[PDB]
Amino acid sequence: VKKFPEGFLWGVATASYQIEGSPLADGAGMSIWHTFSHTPGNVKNGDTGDVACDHYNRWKEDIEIIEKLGVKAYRFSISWPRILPEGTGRVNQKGLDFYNRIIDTLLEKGITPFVTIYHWDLPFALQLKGGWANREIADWFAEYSRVLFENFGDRVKNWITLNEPWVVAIVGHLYGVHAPGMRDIYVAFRAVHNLLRAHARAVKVFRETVKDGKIGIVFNNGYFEPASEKEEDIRAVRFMHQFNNYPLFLNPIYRGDYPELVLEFAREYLPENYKDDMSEIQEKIDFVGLNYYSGHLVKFDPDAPAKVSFVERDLPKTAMGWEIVPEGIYWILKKVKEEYNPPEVYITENGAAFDDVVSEDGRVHDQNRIDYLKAHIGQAWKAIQEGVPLKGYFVWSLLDNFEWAEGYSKRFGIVYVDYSTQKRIVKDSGYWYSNVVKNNGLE
Template sequence: MRFPKGFLWGAATAAYQIEGAPLADGAGASIWHRFSHTPGTILNGDTGDGACDHYHRWQEDIEWMQRLGLNAYRFSVAWGRVLPTGRGAVNPKGLDFYKRLVDGLLRAGITPMITLYHWDLPAELQDMGGWANRDCAKWFADYACLMFRELGDRVSLWATLNEPWVVMALGYLWGQHAPGVRDIGAAAKAGHHMLLGHGRAVQALRAQGLPNAQIGIVTNLGPQQPASDSPQDQMVAALWHNFINRYFLDPIFRGEYPDTVLNFIGEFAPKVAADDMQVIGTPIDFLGVNYYTRNVVAYDASDPIGSRTVHQEGKLHTEMGWEVYPEGLYEILKWVHEEYGPIPLYITENGAAFPDAPNAQGAVDDPLRVDYIRAHLEQAHRALQEGAPLRGYFYWSLMDNFEWAFGYSKRFGLLYVDFATQKRTMKTSGRWYAEFIASQRG
């Protein structure tokens, strides 16, 4: 399979998951720093204090990217590193870290894609309500404006938010992620204000007049399939599809939320001011698709949402308990393209956690991950051949890291990280990916 010339071959990370040193050099605490230091929130009591120590080892990590043959790297900026309280005074040392990182990537021939928000809201902003406070949209746009001003001459690919659905659902509805809120009203507000912040950030980029800059948003998408042909199963599958796949895309591309979801949440539906949808719908340049698995659902009257996920017996599952379903990547790319038109697409995350461990010789052989990447690239290529405007693929993740509520127990990396010594080892999957990328250039 051949991908087009100029296709981006990358890997992705997020600041809190890899950087470590969360309070170093004047950085402000984030909600994930606070959340992970709250007993009972993270498996094994892990925190992001050490992570992969990328804050001090970024040069070594760029060398690993070069060995992998990457021509692109997606990473996020920790908002609180550059604005310790989330607004106001800039922290020059924090800003300088990202300037050095970007310059190092460019010297190495690697195109940076910056995610402005990958879940680590400055804790002081959370004390004022976080994303449930409408003002957070303005705070985010101001922060985005700062980053465009400081790095817009060197960075051409910008993503506003990473997976706002996960922030809304896991952070504000179910409380499994920071800030640990369980409030449907707050969740609906947070979702709307994130979209508003996204739109304002897009407008801020346009106002900068940067001719080469492109901006988009990164969403988690996946097929939501009924367990049977029964009307009830089909009904709940449609609800989940509208909730996960359409809830953030319809406002951006169509100027409205899906009716089925609004009807379901009733009185808790977000309050939409007069020009909100116009701001939210400010045209974007690309859409980032994070794909991991599908969701097969059945009607269940005993469940608060009226449905349950049906485990697919006999199928391969990752350490996260997610079914390996490569066809879903093809299905979701085709759906997005047919539903929302010719917007360029990037696969901004796709990856798997498996029980990796070094052998007696210190090598890390992960054939399941090799199969996973190959199968998903085949499905991406299939979608591309059928007209999906796919521009790049970013494997999640560059290296093993802090996997949110699961701490360091789930390994997604192309590089194995010994967290006690911070030694990186390229896994078999990393070598396979490097060879595949090289074959695309040959």
């Protein structure tokens, strides 16, 4: 038996564009994911978020599932252009109505909201002005955040500025695989810097508006391991951790500068007086959210850009081909404590995609996903025994949904969605997790 601390928060997580559909309903402005997915060639099968899980219309049923499962917290994101269709200026009341009904319903049913302010659906209007590449986005973002804090901060007390700024910057602006689909290393690093500035400015506004609330920020992370004991493989791991994991953002927030290895590598691409902003970037945060999915074997590689390559291992993998390495969640939790000692930590995403089949019984027998979640939850419990201030754990995701450039082909839910009928089918992992929450841990 592995029992969690009293008061531990068990949650599930979604994002607005991945589940809502109706992107243009009720006066919403377009997002960069609406325009990106409507561009041929960017998303598998030509999938878009036009309908998704139709959560825009089915939100009450989906909250009733969270309730039936006994899940205690729901991490969801708000669509910036539903709220401010032009990015700044005029507030769309019907956008506020939509999330208000959600928030009120969650509270009525005793489910704690965790609101992600930005989960990648930038208003298109702002992308016309440069989006994350433009310094002024710190103002735009602070303004938008103010509107949310004023309208929802009476009821919502747990907030996240940004989901995975590394991904927004690097995948969206260097690899070009996500919206807005750019491949320019100088833009990518200006995005990294502006995300940090926007985040800190939103926290500053949060201190003025929501006095009894907590605010944090969420990072993607992988568990990097060296391919050999050669010094250059060991340095490669250190590089990959500093660049791809929390230190890229937490070294600024807690220590006032980018990690040594990141400066070494990327000083050319950062704005020349970037350090002038570090004072403000260090605005105090209440918690760190860590997302974690996979582990990678790394080697120094002279032919690779960045000089690092991944080495495939004989390990179990998900349907994404991502190696399943549960002790990675223990390592990332121990390490964030050793390096930055944040006051509270949450696992804000953990989950897996598997080739789910609805059987003749009308059920989804996803033992593979249970085994995945079980192993990671056990490792998180171990981190807690060793003194990591892990306050909650959120499964990605409540629902199968639009998996970005993968479209609907990759299913992460603990609830299956038949897109033809929009029927929800709770998966065996869904029932299993319900029991984890009831037991407050593993039996």
